[PDB]
Design a protein around this ligand. Structure first.
Ligand SMILES: C[N+](C)(C)CCO
Length: 272
Protein backbone atom coordinates (compact mmCIF):
# COMPACT_ATOMS: atom_id res chain seq x y z
CA UNK A 1 0.00 0.00 0.00
CA UNK A 2 2.49 0.51 -1.75
CA UNK A 3 5.95 -0.68 -0.64
CA UNK A 4 8.74 0.43 -2.95
CA UNK A 5 11.65 -2.08 -3.19
CA UNK A 6 15.00 -0.93 -4.65
CA UNK A 7 17.22 -2.99 -6.90
CA UNK A 8 20.85 -2.33 -7.82
CA UNK A 9 21.82 -2.77 -11.52
CA UNK A 10 22.64 -6.57 -11.10
CA UNK A 11 20.57 -9.59 -12.17
CA UNK A 12 20.87 -10.83 -8.55
CA UNK A 13 19.29 -7.69 -7.08
CA UNK A 14 16.41 -7.84 -9.57
CA UNK A 15 15.70 -11.51 -8.76
CA UNK A 16 15.71 -10.92 -4.93
CA UNK A 17 13.68 -7.71 -5.13
CA UNK A 18 11.00 -9.45 -7.20
CA UNK A 19 11.08 -12.57 -4.84
CA UNK A 20 10.58 -10.35 -1.70
CA UNK A 21 7.81 -8.28 -3.35
CA UNK A 22 5.98 -11.51 -4.42
CA UNK A 23 6.36 -12.92 -0.89
CA UNK A 24 4.90 -9.75 0.73
CA UNK A 25 1.91 -9.85 -1.74
CA UNK A 26 1.42 -13.60 -0.92
CA UNK A 27 0.99 -12.85 2.77
CA UNK A 28 -0.56 -9.40 3.03
CA UNK A 29 -2.75 -6.80 1.26
CA UNK A 30 0.27 -4.56 0.56
CA UNK A 31 1.08 -3.65 -3.06
CA UNK A 32 4.74 -3.66 -4.10
CA UNK A 33 6.66 -1.99 -6.83
CA UNK A 34 10.34 -2.39 -7.91
CA UNK A 35 12.64 0.66 -8.26
CA UNK A 36 15.37 -0.64 -10.67
CA UNK A 37 18.80 0.38 -11.82
CA UNK A 38 20.11 2.01 -8.65
CA UNK A 39 23.78 2.37 -9.51
CA UNK A 40 25.62 1.54 -6.31
CA UNK A 41 25.77 1.06 -2.54
CA UNK A 42 25.71 4.88 -2.15
CA UNK A 43 22.69 5.31 -4.34
CA UNK A 44 20.77 2.73 -2.38
CA UNK A 45 21.85 4.40 0.88
CA UNK A 46 20.56 7.81 -0.04
CA UNK A 47 17.31 6.38 -1.44
CA UNK A 48 16.63 4.74 1.93
CA UNK A 49 17.26 8.01 3.81
CA UNK A 50 15.13 10.18 1.53
CA UNK A 51 12.05 7.94 1.09
CA UNK A 52 12.62 6.91 -2.52
CA UNK A 53 12.72 3.24 -1.52
CA UNK A 54 11.12 1.56 1.47
CA UNK A 55 13.26 -1.63 1.30
CA UNK A 56 16.73 -2.13 -0.24
CA UNK A 57 16.49 -5.75 -1.44
CA UNK A 58 20.23 -6.47 -1.66
CA UNK A 59 22.91 -4.68 0.40
CA UNK A 60 26.43 -6.14 1.02
CA UNK A 61 28.41 -5.74 4.22
CA UNK A 62 31.74 -5.08 2.48
CA UNK A 63 30.19 -2.34 0.32
CA UNK A 64 28.53 -0.58 3.31
CA UNK A 65 31.57 -0.80 5.75
CA UNK A 66 33.89 1.05 3.33
CA UNK A 67 31.44 3.15 1.37
CA UNK A 68 28.74 4.24 3.80
CA UNK A 69 30.28 3.92 7.31
CA UNK A 70 33.85 4.90 6.43
CA UNK A 71 35.05 2.25 8.90
CA UNK A 72 38.23 0.29 8.43
CA UNK A 73 37.10 -2.88 6.69
CA UNK A 74 36.59 -5.75 9.15
CA UNK A 75 37.72 -8.93 7.40
CA UNK A 76 35.82 -11.64 9.43
CA UNK A 77 32.24 -12.26 8.00
CA UNK A 78 30.39 -12.62 11.37
CA UNK A 79 32.19 -9.61 12.94
CA UNK A 80 31.64 -7.48 9.78
CA UNK A 81 27.89 -8.28 9.85
CA UNK A 82 27.47 -7.51 13.56
CA UNK A 83 29.37 -4.20 13.26
CA UNK A 84 27.25 -3.21 10.18
CA UNK A 85 23.95 -4.10 11.97
CA UNK A 86 24.96 -2.09 15.07
CA UNK A 87 26.10 1.05 13.22
CA UNK A 88 23.21 1.07 10.77
CA UNK A 89 20.68 1.15 13.63
CA UNK A 90 22.72 3.76 15.61
CA UNK A 91 23.56 6.14 12.78
CA UNK A 92 20.62 5.84 10.44
CA UNK A 93 17.74 4.07 12.25
CA UNK A 94 17.99 1.41 9.54
CA UNK A 95 17.49 -2.33 10.22
CA UNK A 96 20.19 -4.34 8.43
CA UNK A 97 18.78 -7.93 8.63
CA UNK A 98 20.68 -11.19 8.92
CA UNK A 99 21.92 -12.59 5.55
CA UNK A 100 19.78 -14.38 2.99
CA UNK A 101 22.59 -16.98 3.15
CA UNK A 102 24.90 -15.98 0.24
CA UNK A 103 27.89 -13.63 -0.20
CA UNK A 104 28.74 -12.00 -3.47
CA UNK A 105 32.41 -10.99 -3.44
CA UNK A 106 34.67 -9.51 -6.14
CA UNK A 107 36.88 -12.37 -7.38
CA UNK A 108 39.87 -12.31 -9.66
CA UNK A 109 39.02 -14.94 -12.28
CA UNK A 110 40.90 -16.62 -15.12
CA UNK A 111 40.30 -19.40 -17.63
CA UNK A 112 41.11 -22.92 -16.45
CA UNK A 113 43.61 -23.06 -19.42
CA UNK A 114 45.62 -20.05 -18.19
CA UNK A 115 45.49 -21.20 -14.58
CA UNK A 116 46.80 -24.66 -15.59
CA UNK A 117 49.57 -23.21 -17.93
CA UNK A 118 51.00 -20.86 -15.29
CA UNK A 119 49.99 -22.72 -12.07
CA UNK A 120 47.77 -19.86 -10.87
CA UNK A 121 45.96 -20.43 -7.55
CA UNK A 122 46.10 -17.07 -5.73
CA UNK A 123 46.15 -13.33 -6.48
CA UNK A 124 49.79 -13.21 -5.29
CA UNK A 125 50.66 -15.85 -7.94
CA UNK A 126 49.81 -13.25 -10.67
CA UNK A 127 52.11 -10.57 -9.32
CA UNK A 128 55.02 -11.49 -11.64
CA UNK A 129 52.68 -11.61 -14.67
CA UNK A 130 50.71 -8.41 -14.03
CA UNK A 131 52.43 -6.21 -16.65
CA UNK A 132 51.53 -8.76 -19.37
CA UNK A 133 47.89 -9.32 -18.44
CA UNK A 134 44.68 -7.73 -19.81
CA UNK A 135 42.16 -7.14 -16.89
CA UNK A 136 38.36 -6.81 -17.54
CA UNK A 137 36.42 -5.03 -14.74
CA UNK A 138 33.06 -3.35 -14.03
CA UNK A 139 32.42 0.36 -14.66
CA UNK A 140 32.92 1.42 -10.87
CA UNK A 141 35.79 -0.48 -9.28
CA UNK A 142 38.68 1.39 -11.02
CA UNK A 143 37.57 4.59 -9.16
CA UNK A 144 36.27 3.11 -6.00
CA UNK A 145 38.05 4.46 -2.83
CA UNK A 146 37.84 1.61 -0.28
CA UNK A 147 38.92 -1.59 -1.85
CA UNK A 148 39.08 -0.32 -5.34
CA UNK A 149 41.98 -0.49 -7.80
CA UNK A 150 43.98 2.28 -6.12
CA UNK A 151 44.20 0.43 -2.85
CA UNK A 152 44.57 -2.98 -4.59
CA UNK A 153 47.80 -1.98 -6.39
CA UNK A 154 49.22 -0.56 -3.18
CA UNK A 155 48.30 -3.72 -1.15
CA UNK A 156 49.30 -6.42 -3.61
CA UNK A 157 52.05 -4.34 -5.26
CA UNK A 158 51.18 -5.07 -8.88
CA UNK A 159 49.77 -3.00 -11.73
CA UNK A 160 48.03 -4.62 -14.74
CA UNK A 161 49.35 -3.92 -18.25
CA UNK A 162 45.92 -3.13 -19.62
CA UNK A 163 42.57 -2.32 -18.02
CA UNK A 164 39.18 -2.73 -19.66
CA UNK A 165 36.05 -1.33 -17.88
CA UNK A 166 32.81 -2.91 -19.21
CA UNK A 167 29.26 -3.66 -17.92
CA UNK A 168 29.80 -6.37 -15.21
CA UNK A 169 27.70 -8.70 -17.39
CA UNK A 170 30.21 -8.75 -20.17
CA UNK A 171 33.33 -9.97 -18.32
CA UNK A 172 32.34 -13.67 -18.38
CA UNK A 173 32.41 -14.08 -22.16
CA UNK A 174 35.44 -11.71 -22.38
CA UNK A 175 37.58 -14.10 -20.30
CA UNK A 176 36.22 -17.40 -21.77
CA UNK A 177 36.81 -16.14 -25.31
CA UNK A 178 40.38 -15.10 -24.41
CA UNK A 179 39.82 -11.44 -25.27
CA UNK A 180 40.73 -10.70 -21.59
CA UNK A 181 43.28 -12.66 -19.53
CA UNK A 182 41.81 -11.94 -16.07
CA UNK A 183 38.51 -10.39 -14.87
CA UNK A 184 37.18 -9.04 -11.56
CA UNK A 185 34.04 -11.25 -11.51
CA UNK A 186 31.23 -11.45 -8.98
CA UNK A 187 31.32 -14.77 -7.15
CA UNK A 188 27.56 -15.49 -7.47
CA UNK A 189 27.51 -15.24 -11.22
CA UNK A 190 26.24 -18.52 -12.59
CA UNK A 191 28.56 -18.33 -15.67
CA UNK A 192 31.65 -18.94 -13.48
CA UNK A 193 30.66 -22.59 -13.02
CA UNK A 194 29.00 -22.96 -16.50
CA UNK A 195 32.01 -21.55 -18.38
CA UNK A 196 34.44 -23.53 -16.08
CA UNK A 197 36.28 -20.38 -14.96
CA UNK A 198 38.88 -20.39 -12.09
CA UNK A 199 38.50 -17.90 -9.16
CA UNK A 200 41.91 -17.07 -7.60
CA UNK A 201 42.19 -17.02 -3.83
CA UNK A 202 42.51 -13.53 -2.24
CA UNK A 203 45.49 -14.69 -0.14
CA UNK A 204 46.10 -11.26 1.46
CA UNK A 205 42.35 -10.96 2.33
CA UNK A 206 42.36 -7.59 0.63
CA UNK A 207 38.57 -7.83 0.10
CA UNK A 208 36.17 -7.60 3.01
CA UNK A 209 33.19 -10.12 3.32
CA UNK A 210 30.16 -9.34 1.05
CA UNK A 211 27.30 -11.16 2.88
CA UNK A 212 23.93 -10.07 1.44
CA UNK A 213 20.91 -8.80 3.32
CA UNK A 214 17.73 -6.70 3.01
CA UNK A 215 17.80 -3.24 4.76
CA UNK A 216 14.57 -1.36 5.85
CA UNK A 217 13.95 1.86 7.85
CA UNK A 218 12.63 1.32 11.39
CA UNK A 219 9.81 3.76 10.54
CA UNK A 220 8.61 1.47 7.74
CA UNK A 221 8.63 -1.57 10.10
CA UNK A 222 6.64 0.33 12.79
CA UNK A 223 3.95 1.42 10.26
CA UNK A 224 3.71 -2.04 8.72
CA UNK A 225 4.12 -4.45 11.65
CA UNK A 226 3.57 -7.52 9.47
CA UNK A 227 6.72 -6.84 7.34
CA UNK A 228 9.26 -8.15 9.88
CA UNK A 229 7.73 -11.64 9.93
CA UNK A 230 7.59 -11.77 6.11
CA UNK A 231 11.21 -10.71 5.60
CA UNK A 232 12.31 -13.30 8.19
CA UNK A 233 10.96 -16.06 5.96
CA UNK A 234 13.75 -15.50 3.37
CA UNK A 235 16.66 -15.26 5.83
CA UNK A 236 19.31 -18.00 5.98
CA UNK A 237 17.42 -19.91 3.19
CA UNK A 238 19.34 -19.01 -0.06
CA UNK A 239 22.90 -20.26 -0.15
CA UNK A 240 25.54 -19.26 -2.66
CA UNK A 241 24.95 -22.35 -4.81
CA UNK A 242 21.24 -21.51 -5.08
CA UNK A 243 21.93 -17.84 -5.87
CA UNK A 244 24.32 -18.82 -8.69
CA UNK A 245 21.57 -21.12 -10.21
CA UNK A 246 19.06 -18.30 -10.10
CA UNK A 247 21.48 -15.83 -11.70
CA UNK A 248 22.17 -18.49 -14.41
CA UNK A 249 18.39 -18.67 -15.20
CA UNK A 250 18.45 -14.97 -15.97
CA UNK A 251 21.83 -14.54 -17.65
CA UNK A 252 22.24 -17.97 -19.30
CA UNK A 253 18.57 -19.21 -19.79
CA UNK A 254 17.49 -15.60 -20.59
CA UNK A 255 14.46 -15.54 -18.23
CA UNK A 256 12.94 -12.41 -16.69
CA UNK A 257 14.01 -11.94 -13.07
CA UNK A 258 10.30 -11.86 -12.03
CA UNK A 259 9.76 -15.27 -13.72
CA UNK A 260 12.89 -16.81 -12.09
CA UNK A 261 11.62 -15.55 -8.70
CA UNK A 262 8.08 -16.85 -9.21
CA UNK A 263 9.28 -20.35 -10.27
CA UNK A 264 11.61 -20.58 -7.23
CA UNK A 265 8.89 -19.51 -4.81
CA UNK A 266 6.54 -22.09 -6.35
CA UNK A 267 9.10 -24.88 -6.17
CA UNK A 268 9.90 -24.14 -2.53
CA UNK A 269 6.30 -23.49 -1.56
CA UNK A 270 6.98 -19.89 -0.48
CA UNK A 271 9.41 -21.13 2.28
CA UNK A 272 6.83 -23.05 4.37
C1 LIG B 1 28.44 -6.65 -4.31
N1 LIG B 1 29.55 -6.61 -5.28
C2 LIG B 1 30.78 -6.65 -4.50
C3 LIG B 1 29.62 -7.82 -6.12
C4 LIG B 1 29.39 -5.49 -6.27
C5 LIG B 1 29.27 -4.08 -5.73
O1 LIG B 1 27.92 -3.85 -5.19
Amino acid sequence: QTIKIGAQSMSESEIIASMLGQLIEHHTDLKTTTIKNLGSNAVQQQALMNGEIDIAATRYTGDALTGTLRMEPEKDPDKALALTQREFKKRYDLKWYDSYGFDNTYAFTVSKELADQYHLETVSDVKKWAPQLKLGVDNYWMKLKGNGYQDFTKTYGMTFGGTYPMQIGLVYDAVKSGKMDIVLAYSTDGRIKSYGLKMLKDDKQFFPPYDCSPVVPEKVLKEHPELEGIIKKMLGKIDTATMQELNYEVDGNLKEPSVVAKEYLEKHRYFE
